[PDB]
Amino acid sequence: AMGSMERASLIQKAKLAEQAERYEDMAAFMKGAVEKGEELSCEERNLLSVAYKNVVGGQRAAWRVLSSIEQKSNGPEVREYREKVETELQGVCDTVLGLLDSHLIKEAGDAESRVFYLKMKGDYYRYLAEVATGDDKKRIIDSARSAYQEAMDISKKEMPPTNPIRLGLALNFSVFHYEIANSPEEAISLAKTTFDEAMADLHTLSEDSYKDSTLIMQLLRDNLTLWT
């Protein structure tokens, strides 16, 4: 839909859409920018992720409201409308997954980009798993696990334990273990080891890097407090 707009204009409009809290537009501009075929810079990768996380986040919140009403009720209307929201959510996740597969991951050679995209791949399969119930729910869970695991393997080899991508990957993989994979002990172990290894590396950081790493470490701690 965006093929006639310049890449740089799509990027500029995604930034304006974020400022205006127009996240559907933001996601469409960043999809158009990815489809230009060039690799994304760090800031552009964040724009793509912010846009889709906000769109899918609103869908997930709505699906949870509707699923709760449906479970309490158990005419066809609540199920029909939950199904409509669910299909829309699945379509957004499939769109993001398709961008990652065509061709962001295969062109990502640096650790920072490859880990970021594989974390995204894990996240969007995790959102598919949250609504899955059919013949492929196990398979969707394995797809999330596999993407997160490859990202973890690269991050542990190539990034320091305070790197914010590495920390956010570990946070989200721990949520996957707790909420999707029925592995609360693995979730707790991952969050604790990640927190402790980051703490031991904080001395190497500048003030601004310290603020970024400690912000994510606090999220790990908040989950550990909820889980223990």
Partner: peptide
Amino acid sequence: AGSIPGRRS
């Protein structure tokens, strides 16, 4: 359980 946000708040 909270997952990661995209932006510093």
